[PDB]
Amino acid sequence: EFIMKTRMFEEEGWIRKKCKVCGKPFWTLDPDRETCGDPPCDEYQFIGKPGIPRKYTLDEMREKFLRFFEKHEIYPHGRVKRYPVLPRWRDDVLLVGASIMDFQPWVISGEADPPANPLVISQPSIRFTDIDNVGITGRHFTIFEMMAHHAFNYPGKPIYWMDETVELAFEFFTKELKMKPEDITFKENPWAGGGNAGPAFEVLYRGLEVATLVFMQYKKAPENAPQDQVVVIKGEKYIPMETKVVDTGYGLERLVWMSQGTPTAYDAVLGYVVEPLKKMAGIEKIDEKILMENSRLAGMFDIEDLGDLRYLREQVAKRVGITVEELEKAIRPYELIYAIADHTKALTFMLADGVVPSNVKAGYLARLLIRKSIRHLRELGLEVPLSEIVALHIKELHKTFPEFKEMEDIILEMIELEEKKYAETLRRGSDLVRREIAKLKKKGIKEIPVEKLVTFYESHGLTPEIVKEIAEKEGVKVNIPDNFYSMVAKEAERTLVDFELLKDLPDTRRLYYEDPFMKEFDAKVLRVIKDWVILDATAFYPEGGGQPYDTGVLIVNGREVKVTNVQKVGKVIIHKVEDPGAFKEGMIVHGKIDWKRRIQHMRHHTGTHVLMGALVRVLGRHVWQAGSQLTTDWARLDISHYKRISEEELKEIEMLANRIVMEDRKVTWEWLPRTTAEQKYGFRLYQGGVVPGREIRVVKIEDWDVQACGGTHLPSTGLVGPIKILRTERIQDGVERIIFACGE
Ligand SMILES: [Zn+2]
What we know:
PDB class: ligase
Name: Alanyl-tRNA synthetase
Entry title: Crystal structure of alanyl-tRNA synthetase without oligomerization domain in lysine-methylated form
Distance between the termini: 71 Å
CATH topology of the largest domain: BirA Bifunctional Protein, domain 2
Number of strands: 27
Largest sheet: 12 strands, mixed
Shape: globular
CATH architecture of the largest domain: 2-Layer Sandwich
Radius of gyration: 29 Å
Assembly: monomeric
Helix content: 25-40%
Bound molecules: zinc ion
Keywords: ligase, hydrolase
């Protein structure tokens, strides 16, 4: 269905074939190749025999890639600093799972400018879909770096496309990495990621997929899309888009593994943790071919799709010449070490980038990794705090990722607190599940359902091997599924008046953006739906961003009519009035805002921002808004935070906030293109979540705080008056609330 002929293929003698095993199309220079180069059609050929002629570390390979694209003489790329693994710019995914997620939805739609075009990036990426594979297959990670060159071809502005992408890829592999040209295949296989899809190549070499080259030209299909949708790859329905995006992904770890030829990718990437762990646990060397064969055979073996690891192990057992029991005995301590090594690295990135362990979203996933790793350490017989293993990653990685050093105290404390609380969680959970298990076998069935085992973790915090040893006392039957953690992880993703009657009306001019001190204005009545009056312009603030609506009056024919509620539907502002019959279309009215109410809201709104700057400085840079609500008399600010705020801390925060009020710092706002705002201020802009639009309204307190914000603010901090913190309290794991009052 997709034509993927290129200039390079045509000019350089590449032959399109159909793989004799999987039937997929692939391109090769090798006249005797009949298979695509992808397991199980081909096998890993580089283990014990590096396919790249010189060895590379992570730092070397990453820089090799970045520099190649950056300094390219024909297609120079702008080097872009990696994004946090927490996608502050979007509300639809939990974690960055690919480099392209940095540029969705805003860059791809054309709502944001690309940071550079074309660009090159090495993006730390996290995926939980293969978590049970980690340590088991020799190749799977939860945390990895996807190196990428991206080009955003908006209509009318071509950058580069399919021809140049295959050439750049081939040039990097053959000229920079000295890989054998005829061993490289381009397998046609459509791809998708984070809302978009298109035709793609898998670039295969010595049995390993070393890159994916995706030509994104489709977007997630809207509900009830007509005749021509295209079904691709996982997600089904898509429709064409005008913008064509080059979406590449080169696995840093895989390329390093290709250069090392070690039994597992973990030995090539995580030796600095794997080897101390071996030594600490006193794990003796085992037969090297056990690891090698397992990795090789695992190339052909998925487990997250079918529960057949048992057969992978029967295969590697026969190959090695031992039984499955003695195989399990030998390899198990290594699987445990590999998982610990990987999980502690994932956590280093996650917590450094602002993930707070909790029972929700990405915090839920961090907590999952922490608990799994602690349980792995116990099975190894290793009595070491997890924070000590996390510390080994900070030590190794902080020179490339300075943020790890800067956040180290907080990262290690978060790990320590999670561990020390988990011991408590495990006592209470063990009894509650013992009672439930005893009650289930008392009257009903003595079998543990897979869903109840999932419920056991995410309700009582206990891992399935703990459940089974309590259960096999009375009321037996374990059956821990091979994909237990993959299923537990997927749990983290668990999810005024009318319209079309105001689609025809133009945008309400927002006079409150023109002057926050405007309290009176004249305007024309455009529409009266029920008791909602729509004006062409208004100084009435519509409820949003934690700030309640303005109230006041509209004066019509001398008569005063109360405005009791103000909302926004799309871009049209609606005013609730006590006497709608008084208002007719075309009528010009005088508006009067309840000023006491407005100014009290403004004091708490700007005061919230003053407080935010104080919170970040006292508590740490993981502090981020989880929620906000203002009233006339008080405000609340909810923040992601990992412990109770002590009374002394509260006073430190209060002193700092009031110091800034006393300094009377300027508070300013302006509209900026979103990528321009992001590159200048960072992702801290997105406190209240992510705001749509080509341009975002940025509210800045000089040298203190900056947020994308649509509220009414005071022009200086002195006008807030005293800030008095009344209360701190926990809302849930990972969320602390501060209640405060602003003004004399
Ligand atoms: Zn094939």
